[PDB]
Amino acid sequence: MARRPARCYRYQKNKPYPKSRYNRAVPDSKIRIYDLGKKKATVDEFPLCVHLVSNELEQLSSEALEAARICANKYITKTVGRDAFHLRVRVHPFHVLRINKMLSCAGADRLQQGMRGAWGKPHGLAARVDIGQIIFSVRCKDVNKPVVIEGLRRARYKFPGQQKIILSKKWGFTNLDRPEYIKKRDAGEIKDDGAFVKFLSKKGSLEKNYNEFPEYFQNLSA
Amino acid sequence: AKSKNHTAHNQTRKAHRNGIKKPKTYKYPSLKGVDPKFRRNHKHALHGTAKALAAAKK
Amino acid sequence: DAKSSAYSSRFQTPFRRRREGKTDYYQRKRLVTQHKAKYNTPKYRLVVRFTNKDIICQIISSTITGDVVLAAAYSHELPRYGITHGLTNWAAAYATGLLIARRTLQKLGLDETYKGVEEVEGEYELTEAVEDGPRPFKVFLDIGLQRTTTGARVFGALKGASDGGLYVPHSENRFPGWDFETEEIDPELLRSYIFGGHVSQYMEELADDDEERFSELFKGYLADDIDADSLEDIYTSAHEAIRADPAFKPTEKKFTKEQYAAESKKYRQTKLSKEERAARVAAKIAALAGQQ
Amino acid sequence: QNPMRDLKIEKLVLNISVGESGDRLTRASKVLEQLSGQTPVQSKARYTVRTFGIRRNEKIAVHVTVRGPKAEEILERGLKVKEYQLRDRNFSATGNFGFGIDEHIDLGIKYDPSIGIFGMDFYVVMNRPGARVTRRKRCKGTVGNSHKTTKEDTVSWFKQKYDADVLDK
Amino acid sequence: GKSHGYRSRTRYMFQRDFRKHGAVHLSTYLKVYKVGDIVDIKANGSIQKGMPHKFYQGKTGVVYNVTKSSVGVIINKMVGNRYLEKRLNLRVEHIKHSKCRQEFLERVKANAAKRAEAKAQGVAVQLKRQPAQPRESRIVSTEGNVPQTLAPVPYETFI
RNA sequence: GGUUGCGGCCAUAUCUACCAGAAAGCACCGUUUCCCGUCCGAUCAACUGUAGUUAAGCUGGUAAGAGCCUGACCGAGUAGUGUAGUGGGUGACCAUACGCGAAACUCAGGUGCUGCAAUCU
RNA sequence: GAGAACAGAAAUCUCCAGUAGAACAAAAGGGUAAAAGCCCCCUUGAUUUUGAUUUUCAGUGUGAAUACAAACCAUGAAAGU
RNA sequence: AGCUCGUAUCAGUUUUAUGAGGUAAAGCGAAUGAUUAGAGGUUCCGGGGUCACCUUGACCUAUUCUCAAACUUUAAAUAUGUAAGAAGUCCUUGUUACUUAAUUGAACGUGGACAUUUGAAUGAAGAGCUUUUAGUGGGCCAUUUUUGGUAAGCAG
C-alpha cells in the first residue's frame, strides 16, 4: 500500500504504542544502523561534539531517520572521507503507527463499514521526540566542524519542523565539559573501552581502582 | 438510533442543589450488627443497671 | 556467588529473628493474636526450649514494645532442689515444669488453689476449675521451631506445667507410652519415665552389660556414687522441695555489674572513627602507590 | 592444625540406574540391600524423555546412602578394584568426588543365581564436622569460607589416605 | 461484557510495598481497637479474608464492633445525593489507628493542663489554636551579611 | 559491657572477602536401651554433658566494598502541574502571573537501636 | 554451575549459588518462602438455624464474598484454622 | 403543603495534623520487556584449520544510546478520607447471664470538676424533618485531560 504522508503522523497525538506482546503483527524499522563513521575511534580522537536537536515535540518517522542518516553520511563522507567522524542517531523508532486499512474501489461502501471497528493496523514505526532532545550527534576533530555542520544542515531537510545545530560544550560523546575533561584525562583516571571511556570514582574498592587506574595513583604520588 | 451511553455531566450540580447532607449521627446508635455475644451481655447489664439505680433512689 | 547489585538492592530481608532462624513468625502470629473482644488480656505463652547443657522454660506476655516475662526458670536452679546431673533430661523437663508452674502461681497468688497432683501417675489431667472460684491460670504452650514427636522433652515440660497447677490446654497423643493399636497412654510408662525410668533402666543395663560405657558415660553420676534406684527417690525429694518453696532465690552476682561491664569492655573491640578510616585509607593508597 | 577442622566422609551414595521396572529392578534392590545392610529407595522418573523407554514416575533407579564405618569400609572395598587411585576429574568443585564401577555382584560377594548383573556409581559426600550448622532446624546457619571443602583439600586428604594418587591418565 | 468485579482496577491498590512482601509484622495484631476509635483502611494484599472493597482503601471511620479476629468500621460513602453508613467487617490486618485521634487526645490533655494552670496562675492562656499569624516587624542587620547583588544570568545552551 | 531466652521496629540489621573473641553462654561435638524417624541417630527423637574445640556457627571489627538508610542552599525551584489572560505561535507547544513542587543524579554522614527476664573475671 | 559406569543435551544421584526469575485446575492481575509452592498423615466445615454486612444497587433482587452467634464437627500438642 | 425547633449535629471552603493513591514526571551503570555499539574474559555442550596446539559460534563482567497504555525502585500537582470536644476529658465507684487467673477489662452508667476562648479560620443566607406531586429521562458547546480516526462543525 502507498505510504501515507507524514503530515498525518506529525504530532504525538496518541499514547506510545511499542512493539510488545499486545502489539504483535508489526513490520520492522527501516533504520537499522545507528552508529556510523569511524565508530570505533577512541574518545580523544574526536573531541568536538555537535548535535542536531529538535526544537519542538513531534514524531520522527523511522524511515525519515533512516533517510536523513543516509544523506548525512553521504555529505560528510565524500567531504572528509570515511573515517573522520562518528555519528550516532540518538532517537529510536519504538512508536508503532496505526493505519485504518480501507477499500477505495468501485462502490466499496458496501464491502466496507467505515468507522465501525476502526482500530487501525500497524503502518510503520516512528520515533517520539520532545523539545530539546537530540536527534543526531556527530563527533569529529575540531577542524571538521564546517563539514559536519553542513552535513547536519543537509540532514535537517529530511525532518519536519525546526531543528538546530548546537555545538555542544562537552568533550565528544562524554558528559564532561572540554576544559575539565582535559584535566581529567591528564590526571589519568580515564580508560578507553573500545569507543568510550571509564571514569575513576572516589568511591570503590581501592584494589579494584588500582587494577583499573594505576596511572592516577602514580600521577598523584609523583 | 445510536443512543448515548453514559454521562456524569450536571450530576454533581444536581447533587449539590439540595446539598449533600451528613447522616445526622445520634447518641446511642443502632446496635445492629454489633457482636451478639456483646449484645446480650449489654442486655443483662442494662437491666441490672436500671434495677440498681432505681432501687438505690427508692 | 558474586551477587549482582540489582539483586542486593531488591533483596527483601526476613524479620531479624527469622533471619537468624530462632522464631517461627507464622506460628507466632497465631500464638500472639487474641480474640479482639478480649482487649487487653495477654495471651500468656509457656515457652520451653532446650539449649544443650540447659533447659529454658518461662511464661511470657506479648506487649507492643516486646515480650515481657512473668516468671522464668532455667536448669542451673535445679541443683538447689537437688537434681545435680542431667539438668536437661526429660525428667528435668518435667521437674522444671513443676518449678515454673508453682513459681508463677505463687507470683499471682494462687498457692493454696491449684495444687496440681502430688502423686503423679502419668494420667492426662488438666487442672479442674475450683468450684465457686477463679478459673485456673491458662497459658499456651510454645514449642518453637523444634519438631513435635511422641514422648518429647518439650511435652515433658508440658506435663510439668500442667501438674504444677498451671492449666495448659493439651492432649496426651505425644506423651511417651502412646500406642497406636490403642488410644491409651501407658500411665506406668509415663510415671516411670518421670522419675528417670528411661535413664535408670539404662543405668542398670549398662552396669550389667559392661563397665567401660557405664563409667565413661554418667561419670558425673559415678562421682555421686548413685545407682539407678536412687534416681526416683531424689526426684521425689526434688519435687517436694519444688512444691515447698518455689521462691526463685537468684544468684549472688559475685564480681558485680561494674566489673562485668568494664571487663567485657576491656577486651571488646571498638569501631574506628571516620578520621581513622580516612587516615588508614590514605596510608593504604600511599603504600599501594609507593612505586608498586 | 585443628582437632576437628579436617575432612570426613559423611555419606557415600551408591546408585544403580535400571533401564526399566520389574524383576530386574527388584534384583538391583536386593543386591544393593545386602551390600549396604539397608534397603535402598526407588528414584521415580522425573519426566518422560520419550527416547529412553522411560515415563515419569516409573521407578528407573535404585540408590542408597551409607554413613559412618559402613561408608568407610565400603569405600575401601570400592577402591580395592579402583586400584586406590582416581583422576584429576571425578572431583567436584564442592569437595565431593565420585566414580562408577561396572560390576559388583561377583566382584565383592558370591554371584548367586537369579540376580543378573549390575554396575553402580559411588559418590562420596566429603566434608568436615560442623556442617550441621546448615542442616539443623533451629538457627539454620551457613558454613564459612575456611570450613568449606575444595577439590585441592580433598585431593590432599585422598593422598593422605588410601595410598592414592590423582590423574591416572 | 465490561467487567466491574470485586477487585476490578486493583493492579496497584494491593501491591505489597517494595521490600515489604511476605507476612506482615505482628504489631498490627497486637494493637487494641476499642469501640469509638477512628481508624483508616490500608488494605493488605497478603491476607485475603476480610479484604475491603477498593473504594474503602484510605478511608477512615469509627469502630462500631469488635469481633473474634476483625472489627466493624463505619464509613460514610457518598452515593447519589447523600452519604450512607457503610458497615465493614474487616480483618485487623487492613486497619490501623489513625493518628488524628492521638494528636487530638494529646492536645486535649495539654489544653486541660493549660486550663488548670490558668485556674491557678496566669489566666487567658490562649486555649485555641492560632494559625500562622503574619510575621511581626524585625531588624535585619548587616555585619558579615553585606548585601551582595544577584544579576540575572545569560542563557547558555549547555547542550 | 558480653551471652542466652522471648521479642519490637524489619537490611543503619542485608551481602561479599579478612580477622579477633578473655569468663560465661551458645554451637560444633560424644553415644543409641527406651520415646521417636528415616535407606542413612545425616535431620529429628533419647542420654551424657561425659572426650575436646573455637574450626565452623554466633557476636564483633576491617573494606576510598556493592547495597541499605538519612540529609544537603546537590541536581532544582529544573521536570511536572492547579488556576488566569482578547498572552505568543498556524500548530505542535511555549513564556508569563499567582501557587504546589519532585525523581534520577553530586556530595556528606551512618552500617543497628531497643524492651523484659536470666547469666558471666 | 560442578560432579558420578553404561548414561551423551536430556535417564538417576550428590553438593553449591539461588528475593522467587517456579507452583498454586483453567484467561489476566494480585498474593504467597521453616508458605498460599512439592511430599506425607488425618478428615469432610463442600453440614444446620438463620440473621447482619460489602459489591453490582433503587442501597431492590440474583450471584459472589466478608464477619459473627447458636450447634455439631474436622485437624492440630495447642493457640488457632 | 407544611411540621419541630430558634442559631444549631452545618459548609461544593480553608489551616494544622493525619492518612490513602501510582497519573504527570522520572528510571533503566534497578526488576520484567525492548533496544545501538563495542571493550575484557570460556568447558575437549561442536574450532570450521595441524587430535592440548592464535584461530572466532556463545555466555558473563564493567560500560554506552534511546524507550514503554496493559513495565517500575521512586514519585508530584490537582482531586480525596478524617479529626479539631460539653454526644469531650478527668476522678471515684455501680450492673453484666460478656471477658478475665483475677474484686481484670469492655460497654453502659451513678455522683464530682470543667467562662473570660466550650478548645482552628470564615460564613451561616434560619436549621432539621416529613408528605406529596409535576415536568425530565433525544441533549449541545467551550478551556483543560483524553480514546478511535488522516481529520472533521466526527463519534465516545
Closest C-alpha among C114, C118, C126 to residue C171: C126
Q: Give bridge partners of residue D61 from the DSSP assignment.
A: D17
Q: Which residue has the cell 562524554?
A: A174
The arrangement of strands across the sheet holding D120-127 comes to D41-42, D61-67, D8-17, D120-127, D97-101
Q: Rounded to an integer, what distance in angstroms lies between the CA atom of residue E52 and that of residue E44? A: 9
Helix/strand/coil (H/E/C) assignment for every residue in chain E: CCCCCCCCCCCCCCCCCCCCCCCCCCHHHHCCCCCCCEEEECCCCCCCCCCCCHHHCCCEEEEEEECCCEEEEEEEEEECCEEEEEEEEEECCCEEECHHHHHHHHHHHHHHHHHHHHHHCCCCCCCCCCCCCCCCCCCCCCCCCCCCCCCCCCCCCCC
Angle at C261 (CA atoms; ends C257, C265), nearest 5 degrees: 165
Q: Rounded to an integer, what distance in angstroms lies between the CA atom of residue D105 and that of residue D119? A: 8
Nearest CA in chain E to A168: E159
Q: Rounded to an integer, what distance in angstroms lies between the CA atom of residue B35 and that of residue B19? A: 35
**What pairing do the DSSP bridges indicate for beta strands C56-62 and C67-74?**
antiparallel
Contacts of C37 in chain B (CB under 8 A): 35, 37-38
Determine the 3-state secondary structure of C151 from DSSP.
Answer: coil
Nearest CA in chain C to D135: C21
DSSP C15: P
Closest C-alpha among C48, C47, C51, C49 to residue C62: C47
Give the three cell numbers for residue A56: 519542538
End-to-end CA distance of chain D: 33
- Contact assignment for A221 to C284 by CB distance below 8 Å: no
Q: For helices C197-209 and C230-244, what crossing angle results, to 10°?
A: 150
Give the three cell numbers for residue A62: 523511522
If one counts every other C-beta atom within 10 angstroms of the C-beta of residue B31, the result is 14
Q: Are C205 and C154 in contact (CB under 8 A)?
A: no
Q: Rounded to an integer, what distance in angstroms lies between the CA atom of residue C40 and that of residue C34? A: 9
Q: Where are the beta strands (DSSP E) in chain C?
A: 45-49, 56-62, 67-74, 140-142
Nearest CA in chain D to C49: D138
Alpha-carbon torsion angle C77, C82, C84, C88, nearest 10: -60
What values do phi and psi take at D8, rounded to 5? -160, 165
Q: Rounded to an integer, what distance in angstroms lies between the CA atom of residue E24 and that of residue E21? A: 8
Angle at C75 (CA atoms; ends C72, C81), nearest 5 degrees: 95
Q: Give bridge partners of residue A192 from the DSSP assignment.
A: A197
Q: This structure's resolution (angstroms)?
A: 3.0
Q: Rounded to an integer, what distance in angstroms lies between the CA atom of residue C160 and that of residue C155? A: 8
Closest C-alpha among E55, E61, E76, E62 to residue B22: E76
Q: What Rg, from alpha-carbon coordinates, does chain E have?
A: 26
Is strand F in 7 Å reach of the CB of C274?
Answer: yes
Question: Quick check: E2 contacting C, CB < 8 Å?
Answer: no
- Contact assignment for E64 to B22 by CB distance below 8 Å: no
Q: Rounded to an integer, what distance in angstroms lies between the CA atom of residue C174 and that of residue A98? A: 71
Q: Are E70 and E41 in contact (CB under 8 A)?
A: no
Is strand H in 7 Å reach of the CB of E36?
Answer: yes
Closest C-alpha among C107, C101, C104, C53 to residue C75: C53
Q: Give bridge partners of residue C69 from the DSSP assignment.
A: C60
Q: Are E77 and E84 in contact (CB under 8 A)?
A: yes
If one counts every other C-beta atom within 10 angstroms of the C-beta of residue D21, the result is 16
Q: Rounded to an integer, what distance in angstroms lies between the CA atom of residue A187 and that of residue E70? A: 67
Q: Which helix (H) or strand (E) holds C243?
A: helix C230-244
Contacts of E78 in chain B (CB under 8 A): 20
Q: Which residue has the cell 482503601?
A: E57
What residues have CB less than 8 Å from A210, skipping those under 6 apart? Answer: A217, C288, C289
If one counts every other C-beta atom within 10 angstroms of the C-beta of residue E108, the result is 10
Determine the 3-state secondary structure of C220 from DSSP.
Answer: helix
Angle at C153 (CA atoms; ends C148, C155), nearest 5 degrees: 60
What residues have CB less than 8 Å from E97, skipping those under 6 apart? Answer: E31, E33, E37, E39
End-to-end CA distance of chain E: 52
If one counts every other C-beta atom within 10 angstroms of the C-beta of residue A98, the result is 16
What residues have CB less than 8 Å from E96, skipping those under 6 apart? Answer: E28, E31, E39, E40, E42
Touch between A and C (at least 3 CB pairs under 8 Å): yes
Q: Which residue has the cell 511464661?
A: C59
Closest C-alpha among A58, A88, A71, A61 to residue A168: A88
Q: Rounded to an integer, what distance in angstroms lies between the CA atom of residue A160 and that of residue A122? A: 22
Q: Which nucleotide is nearest to C42 (CA to C1')?
A: H100
Determine the 3-state secondary structure of C195 from DSSP.
Answer: coil
What values do phi and psi take at E55, rounded to 5? -70, -35
- Contact assignment for E158 to A132 by CB distance below 8 Å: no
DSSP A15-65: PP--SSSSS-S----S----EEESTT--GGG--EEEEEEESS-BEEEHHHH
What residues have CB less than 8 Å from D166, skipping those under 6 apart? Answer: D85, D86, D87, D88, D91, D155, D158, D159
Is strand F in 7 Å reach of the CB of C135?
Answer: no
Give the three cell numbers for residue A13: 497525538
Closest C-alpha among A191, A173, A171, A172 to residue A181: A171
**What pairing do the DSSP bridges indicate for beta strands E60-66 and E70-79?**
antiparallel
Q: Rounded to an integer, what distance in angstroms lies between the CA atom of residue E113 and that of residue C197? A: 68
What values do phi and psi take at A60, rounded to 5? -95, 120
